[PDB]
Structures are given as C-alpha cells and as structure tokens.
Amino acid sequence: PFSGLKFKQNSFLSTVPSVTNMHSMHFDARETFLGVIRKALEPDTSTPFPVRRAFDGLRAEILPNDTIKSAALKAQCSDIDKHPELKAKMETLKEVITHHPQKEKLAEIALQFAREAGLTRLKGETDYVLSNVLDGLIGDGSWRAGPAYESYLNKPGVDRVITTVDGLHMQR
Amino acid sequence: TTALVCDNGSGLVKAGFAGDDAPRAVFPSIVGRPRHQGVMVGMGQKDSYVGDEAQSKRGILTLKYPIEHGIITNWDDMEKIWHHTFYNELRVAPEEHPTLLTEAPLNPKANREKMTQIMFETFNVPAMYVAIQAVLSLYASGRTTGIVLDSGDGVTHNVPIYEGYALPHAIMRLDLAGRDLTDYLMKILTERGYSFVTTAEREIVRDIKEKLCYVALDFENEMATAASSSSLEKSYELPDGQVITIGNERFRCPETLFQPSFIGMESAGIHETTYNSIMKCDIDIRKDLYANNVMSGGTTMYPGIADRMQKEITALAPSTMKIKIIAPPERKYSVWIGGSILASLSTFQQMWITKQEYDEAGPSIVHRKCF
Amino acid sequence: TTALVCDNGSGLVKAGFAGDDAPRAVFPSIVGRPRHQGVMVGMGQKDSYVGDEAQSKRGILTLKYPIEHGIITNWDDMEKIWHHTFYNELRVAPEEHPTLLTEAPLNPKANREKMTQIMFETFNVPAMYVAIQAVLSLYASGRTTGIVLDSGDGVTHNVPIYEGYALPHAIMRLDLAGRDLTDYLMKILTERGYSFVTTAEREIVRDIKEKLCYVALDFENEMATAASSSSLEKSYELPDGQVITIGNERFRCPETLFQPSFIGMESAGIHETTYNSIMKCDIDIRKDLYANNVMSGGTTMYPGIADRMQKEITALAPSTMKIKIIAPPERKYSVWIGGSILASLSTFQQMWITKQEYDEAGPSIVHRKCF
Amino acid sequence: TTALVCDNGSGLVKAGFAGDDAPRAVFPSIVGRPRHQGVMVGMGQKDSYVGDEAQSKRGILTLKYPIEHGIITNWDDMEKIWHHTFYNELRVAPEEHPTLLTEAPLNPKANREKMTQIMFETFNVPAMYVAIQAVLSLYASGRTTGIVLDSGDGVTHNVPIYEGYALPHAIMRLDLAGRDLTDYLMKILTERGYSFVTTAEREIVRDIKEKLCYVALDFENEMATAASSSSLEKSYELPDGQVITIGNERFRCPETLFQPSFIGMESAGIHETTYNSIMKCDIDIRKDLYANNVMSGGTTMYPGIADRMQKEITALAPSTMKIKIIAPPERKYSVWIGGSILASLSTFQQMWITKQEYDEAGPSIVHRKCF
Ligand SMILES: Nc1ncnc2c1ncn2[C@@H]1O[C@H](COP(=O)(O)OP(=O)(O)O)[C@@H](O)[C@H]1O
C-alpha cells in the first residue's frame, strides 16, 4: 500500500538536537525523538499524490505535532487491545519504517537518544507507540535491557596519582 | 469582512490587515531551538523560540531558516511561524478573516499545493488566494505597464507586464539574493581576521551588511580609491564591545548582484537578466518596458543601486531609448502594499478560493484558479 | 517532611533545614586524634574528636582535614563527620529526611558515586541529590543570568550561566583557595621570626589571616607605603599571651589570588580566569555576563577585593562595557542559602534520586539525574 | 641552487630540501622561557629555548605555541622558530636558497604579507612562494582530481580539485584539530582523577592521545562494550613512574571530530563538512570526487578513522556511487612531500616571487602571484 515512497536523504539531520542539550534539566527526549522520526518519514514530491496524502493522514493520526494530540494519543494507547484499527495502523507504520533507506542512521540516533537523554528509562515499560517504532529501527529488541552504563566504584585502578598541582597541596 | 495579507518571504515575514497603508507586524522568519545545557529549575521549558524572541536570545539558540531560496523546506517550522503570526502578532482569529499569500514564479507545484492544504485544513481559513509577488509590487506602484525587479532574501525574479498582460515566456528567476550576499560577506570578512561561523554571527554579519554596504558606480574605479586611501573605511561595534573596520568589503559584497561569478555561479548579472527579459517580449512594447523599471524588495535598498542599474541598462539599451528607474522609498514593502490594494478592490472578491470549492476539487485547484 | 541541606565544604560543614534563612550548624571539618599517652584514668577518653570539640583540645591533638582540593580522601574520617552532623549537630534521624549535597564542578566521578553509597546504605536516607555549588550560589542571589566565582577553602571555580542555560565548555577550575593562602602566610610569617609548624598552629595562622588580611587596590603603591612608615602595622595576641606585629604581610597574602606565581603555580589569577571564562561564551551574551559577576565563599570576604576585581576586569574588557561586581554581605553562606531555596521548590521535587531508583541502577544513577 | 620547503604547521615544523623524499628536520613548534628563579651562577644563562630543547626542559619552562589555529599570533617567537630552522636544524644560509612556505585557505591576508616581509627583509631570501597546504597534499598522491581533507594541529580544511581546477566557493574551513582534541582529553581525564593543568602536562596528555586513542566504527556499541567489560582498558606510565589507566576515553576523544557538539561548537562533523563541500561543486564532477577522497595530516592517523569516514559518506551519498578513501601510510608528510615535488618541477621556476619583484610592488605582491 506504500510502494515507491521516496524520502529526502538528509531531511532529519537538521532536527536532531545537540548532545549538550540532551542533558537539559527540562528535556523531553520522547517528543524530540518522535519529532526526528516524523521529519525522517516526510513524503517527497516524487511520491504519487494519492499515496502521499494517505501516508500524510496516517502520519498525522499516529505522529502529530501538537502537544495535546500527542498526549491524547499516549493516554488512549494505554489500553490498546480495544483499538484494533490502531494496531493495523501501527503495523503499517512498522512495515514502512523497517524498509527506510536511512535505517542505520535512524537506529544510531535512537541509540544516542537512549544513552544520553535516556529515551528508554522504563526498560520494557515504554509507550506502545515508542515500542513499535524502536522495534522497527532496531529489530533485535535488545533496547528492553538498557544502555549498560559504566561504573567507577569497582576500583579497577587504585589511582594514587599525584600530579604537579596536586603535589603542592598534599596532605599527609 | 476585513482581509489579511501575509507576505511570506525567506527573510522577513510582513503581515497586516488589508486596506491599510503600511504593514503592522514585521518579524524575521527564524525558528530557534536551545543549544546548550539547561541547569536551573524553572528556566527553560521552551522547546522552540520563534520570531523576535529568537533574535533576543541568540546567545543560546540555533537559528534555522524555514523558507530557504523561496521554497519552503521545513514545513513544521513554517506551521509554527504561521501560528505565531496569526495568534500573537496580528491577534486575530484565522477562521474569521480572509487571507492572502505570496509566491515567487517558477516554484514547484507541490509547494503551493501543500500551502493550500495547510491553510484549509490546520487553520480552517474561510478563503485564501496565492498571488505572484511582482504583480502585487506593480499594483502598489500605481501603474499598468512596466518590468518589475523584485529581489529579497531568497529569490530575485523579473516579470514584464504590459497593459495588464504578463508574458510568462519572458519571466526570469535567479537564486541569488540577500542571504547569498551575507554568506559571501562572511567569506570575505575572514581576510581581516574576523571570523563568524555560527547562526547568531550570521545575523550579526547581516546587520553589518544592511548598515554599511553600498553599490559603487564604477567597481574598478572604486577599488582603486579604497586601495589608495582610507576614506571609504568605516567602523561598526560588535555586540560584545569589540570594534571592527571594513574597507573594500563595503562595495565588493553587493557587487555579486552584478557579477554572480564571485560566488561561483555561471549565471549572468541582474542587469543583463533584466535586459534579456525585455528582449524576450514583443518588439512594440520594448519602448514602454524601458521606461518603467520598477524595483522592490530589501536587497534593492542599497544606496546607489538604482543609478548603477540605470547606467548598465543604458549601456545595453539602444541609444535612442529612454531608461527610467522607479525606486519608491517604501519599496521594502511594495509587495505588501500591492497585496493590500488587491485585497480591497471590488472586482477581486470573485477571484477567491473557498472551502466548498476545495472539498470538490482538492489541492489541485490552486493551479487552475491562480497564476 | 522537611529536607536537609548539607554543604560539605573543604573547610567548613554547613548544615540546616530547607526553608531556613541561615544554616543551623557551622563547624570546622576536622577530625583530631591524640598524639600523647594518657596517664590519668577515671575520666572519659575518646579516640577521636570531631568539629568544635576537636578545636578546643587542639593543643593535644593532631588535626586532619578529610577533604582536600575539593575531593574526599579519608572516607572513614568523612563518615564520622556526617554521623556527627546528623546526630550531634542536627539531632535528627537521616532515615526520615531527604538530603541534598553539594560538589565542586569537574570532580572525579568516584567521589560522587561514594557519596551516594554512603548515604543509601550507611545512613539509609529516603532520597538524595548532588548539585553544583556554583549554581546554588546563583539561586540565593535571586538571578537567572551571570557568571559565578565561588572560592572556598579548596577550589576556585567559574560557571557562566545564561537564562538558566550553562556553558560547560566555559567552566574554569583552579586549586587555589583559602587553605593555600593559609599555608602561604605560614611561610612569609617566618620572615619576622614567627614559626608555625604544628597543625594546631595552622589554626592560629588561619585566624590571623581572617582578622587582619585585606586586598590592596594597587600592589606597588601599597608596598611602598608599608615600606615607608608604620601605618599599616597591626597587633595580634597569641593564645599564650605573646604579641605579634605584622606589616606588609597583611596584603601580600591575598595577592596570590591575582598573582599565583608566588606559590609556584603556573595558572593565571582569578581576574584573568574570570575574563577567560567569559570569552569562551557566545558573543551575544558577553554584555550581560560583564554586569552580573556574582561572588560567594569565604575566600571572597577580604576587605577591598570587590574593588580590586572591579578595577582589573575593566582593564581587560573593552571601554564600552560596564563592569558590576556583586558581593552581598552574607556571601559566606550563599551556597547553602541557595541550597535551602532549591530544596524548597515545588518543581524540584521530581528530581530526587529515590531509594527505589538506586537499588535498580546502582551508584551510577547519580551521573544521570545530577549535572 | 636547491630550493627549501618549510611547512610551519600549527604544531610541528617540517623542513628539508626539494627533491628529497622525507623532511630532514621535524621538531615541535614551541618556544619556552623559564618560570623559576635561578640560583647557580654560570648555568642559567639562556633566555628561551626552541624546539626539542624546550621539550626536554619542559619541567622548568612555560611552553607557548607561536601559532594558534593556523594564524601566527606571536611574531617574535615565529622569528626565533624560523631562525632556528634555517641555522641549527638545516645548517644553511637562507640568503642562498629559495623557500616555499605553506598556509591554510581562508587565512587572514595580513598573515601572508608579514610572512613575505619577514622572509624578504630579515632573512633576505632570494625568492619565496606561498602554497595552499591542501593543494600540495594532492601533488604527493599521483593524482590531479579529488577532494583533500587536511587536518593538522590547528586547522581542518577541505579543498575540492577537479582536473587541476579548484572550486574556491566550495572550500570549507573548520577550527577543530589536534590541539582541541588534546584539550578535550585533558578535560575528560579528570573524571578518573587525573588532573593536568600545566603546559608540560598538556604535552603529556598529547603524547597519551597520540599513543592510545582510536576511532570507533560504531560509537554506541563501543560505549556499551567498554562499559560491560575491561577489554578496552590500557595502561600508560607517566614520566615519574606513576601508572594511569583509561577506558572509554580512548575513543571518546577522537569522536569530537564527527560530533563537534561535545566541545561546545555548533559546526558539523568532518564527514558532513566533506559532503557539503562536495555537494557545492558541479553536478558532473561529483562522481569523480566520491572516488578520490585524499586524507592527510597528523590528526588523520587515528586507527580506523578511514573506515569510519567511508561508512559515514556511504550513509550520506546515494547508493549507486562508489566511495573510496585514500589514506597512504605517509600522510603525516603528504603536504611536505607535495611541496618538495612542486619546487622540483621545471615548470615552477617561473612562478617564484623574486626579490626585485617584491621591491617594486611591496607586500601586496604575494596576493597576486599566489592563490
Ligand atoms: N537597508 C538595507 N540595505 C541593504 N539590504 C537590506 C536593507 N534592508 C533589508 N535588506 C536585505 O533584504 C533582505 C530581505 O528583505 P525583504 O525584502 O524583507 O525580503 P523578502 O522579500 O524575502 O521579505 C535581508 O536579508 C536584508 O539583507
């Protein structure tokens, strides 16, 4: 139903934020990531008009831009088993996402969002609309585990390093 | 009821109520997202600054231009800008006021189709119309014959109009405008140790170009004078207190309008483009089109550009013909004034596009009803 | 429930409850152990003393600072001070009150990870959080923009913040603060025959520095004046009754803050660092940063230091800008005062690191929820 | 007579005779002066050290780089550097040999005029010529078509050349190179407790970066790999016998080349800069440019950076195009080898700027006869 959908190669590059802004105190990693995904799937002119419109309508229903629309969709998606039409629409979105020519860049951007801003901190309890999207970008499903951060308390190196500035004001 | 005119250009968004002499809201078409980390509670909670607040807080933002080279690219940013214009600057309800938008010639059809779809679906506008910018400019000039040179921040275009009959086969478009001049000035201020690489620095260099540059009558003669003495050099104060002085960059920056070879383009200068635009029309109207060079847009505001235009066209033109340049002082807003005129003429209210028509024909109606 | 704010400085420990105006308990951060053999049985002898009680018996003890240059070194001694802080100074149970801690920027990550483990397991606090000291200083000042210079006992650092957004690449740190000055004064006091070698006597010198030292507006002119007459000489009474008189040592000791080469450091003075920190920020925010220099910490309490900083920054900055130095009279507790405010924000209550979250993620969770 | 070639890079000086396959003298471009007070007579009698001598005695010197981002900022130190290169390293009289110098594109024009003046007055060279570094790098590859990514200590720039013709409007320059990476590594080394603040410690950090850093093909999987085990950790011995161990910092430091946002810069990575520079050329030469990426400079020999660059460009380019990266093992001296070749050509002996030609025209002559 979505054959021939061509996209701009670098449409979504201008949307991804800076790494320093990921650690902002008030930063919605979910909304920024969904905006990047929304930009990544914009139909171009080469796509025929009817399928273009149909995909635009589906994208508007599932991936809106207004905050109230996103909140309403998330709230109505908690009990998703009573909306089989949403299931079908999400599956259709997955099928076109999984064949995106820029899947690798999208997957690495998703991993960067997960590691820096903590896109998936619920580690398997993430929103349904995020679950299928991430499954499309990365099909292994390993994002349920987590970024696997690092630790320093295991003392792999006993340190005890005293450089020039630390050698002056040395205590004991 | 009262009509709305919203001249969406690449550089500045000019909007206001129709039937008025001058615009009411002029704000740059810039959308800004914070760049650095936010560390203090309560400060932040603003994903995107758009309009003038995107110019106040330039230190911490990345400024993106939604409407590059005339064609809208980032449609979400354009939607934000339109929402801002309708709900904050004009303070009007979009569903209770007819609107009017502008577009350059030779644009992709998909652009205006998506424009109409956004206007009729997201905003639920009652009626709308898309007009080519230079015809509006001619409306503002109070004339019925002439050739118009509109040069803004994105696109420089020409259309020769004779007795209300435009000649589509003579329309010329050239993607060389204000933003290219600003970038060229950026590349040339490095020759004095001044470096500008970020978007806020882009706005600063654009301000320098607006406030100090001028068009030299004889580029070769002016270049000798600048290299001979220091009368041409001026001083500008950067926002952080440093003082810069620029010399031959004052008139080498706007020269790219006449010699697009400076930025590597193979196309010819604007004067020769205007000359060619006339030679593609019928022989009996060339006399009138020489005598009605109307020019509009911000990029046309440089001091002396009218005289250089006149001299170049006279050099190209036959000796008998009279070359006259019409440069009204308010030409920075000629397009908006023409939109205001056209939205208030009685014979225009039958050339609207209505939601009832939209539903029957779809987004394809715009090419059939508009030019 | 009421939150606890405990600022573990290098020199002093400031503790209290959120919502109060001043810390309830301020005691020195030293742990002392006897260095002689007891002979008298039948009286209470303790192996260690913490805080003020250690000061009163410093004639028989060996004082050790469990924090140096901003990083905690002796964890067993550090644990004692917290236990003294929670039970003997505050008379509270840490299992009931959340705690907010402070830390200098650019400290090793192992330092703050241990602070999480020693509070979720040794004391079993409901939740905790770690904040940058420089930011807390800005909160107490009732601002949202400026450049903060906090200099305490161990670390002098700068953190420029614009509209609640920090610039981490512009953060500066120097290991030059009050403890280094006390060691410098203890060296040049050997010029007149005064010797101080024991840790007990270093406390005496630290008191001499507080009550007599000041920053001269001009170093050369002051040096000539003190070398000409005996106007600047002042007297101090040692605890054994002996009297000491000092002359030019009064303003030579705090001069190291502007000329670090006295103590062998290759780094530049604080005024150059503050200027160097500003120039790493964006061009459009330098005007605001010049007029919002905020100071805090004990090392800033010297008489005349605000004027000397005001004079020096002006010379390096351009003549157009205005330099304003902000030194509120209670800046010795600015970090803690901002700590009480921040813990009292209703919006801040979502940023705590709960006990449940720690058991899921481990000590490394402090690196994600804390800047 | 035999020509001289002297590549006064930002970090290292390369010198030698034309026609030789490798430089004869390679020493770091640093001038140091003592910072402690000498005490033994007859031993401290020098004022400043140049090159390797400054590196050997860096424990008691303050090392300063006379070049910052490809632009010379301390001209007396540069005079010392050139004097040393001519006399103590090459042991030739500059008054008997023509010299060839190198410069990055888009450099301030005053920088090369003063170079010409210093060469033609202080050293009295018979003739001299200034060449763009990136163009020379292409000579020492046996090709006349390709895009050159030269990245040294100060400046990373791109120069696209097709069939011997350069497209100057497509030249990209970026102030992000080896020195910035060393500074970033110094900043993040404090996370493990290692603090380096002095210039000698800056040299130590630079050596560590040279010896233990590598570019990860996939950043996020590499970060997980290093955080899950200890396979990537490596040990380095500080000169005083202490041992330091680094982890993810091995591939985090070179990552700033592809993500400049780590160090607060807004510009895009080197791969995006290469792609943008290629896309600004004519549509008929992109296919050849994709197949002839030439990489040269000291910052280019991170292990595996060629594969990462190829992967990124493959992601950015269309599928049907073939991306080939050319990274010969001798790319630390590609610029110098090309300079040796060019001065050795028989068709170049007519483009030297002779002494007589400089006297007639002045320092402005170097702008006309050089690109
Ligand atoms: N006084 C001036 N002198 C020179 N250039 C100007 C002046 N005012 C505006 N400009 C240039 O005009 C450009 C856009 O002006 P405008 O005509 O509003 O564009 P548009 O037609 O796209 O709305 C700006 O980029 C600016 O560089």
Ligand SMILES: Nc1ncnc2c1ncn2[C@@H]1O[C@H](COP(=O)(O)OP(=O)(O)O)[C@@H](O)[C@H]1O
């Ligand atoms: N009135 C004063 N004049 C000069 N120095 C002072 C004064 N009061 C305190 N100090 C010094 O300030 C230093 C640090 O105090 P404080 O601000 O508590 O540091 P911290 O920020 O580490 O808690 C102390 O070592 C003390 O010597």
Ligand SMILES: Nc1ncnc2c1ncn2[C@@H]1O[C@H](COP(=O)(O)OP(=O)(O)O)[C@@H](O)[C@H]1O
């Ligand atoms: N093997 C290496 N790995 C990583 N970086 C290196 C290596 N060798 C040299 N460098 C870095 O390359 C930088 C620039 O070297 P060079 O090419 O001589 O600069 P320039 O082009 O200015 O002469 C040096 O500062 C050094 O830190």
Ligand SMILES: [Mg+2]
């Ligand atoms: Mg316009």
Ligand SMILES: [Mg+2]
């Ligand atoms: Mg403190």
Ligand SMILES: [Mg+2]
């Ligand atoms: Mg080089």
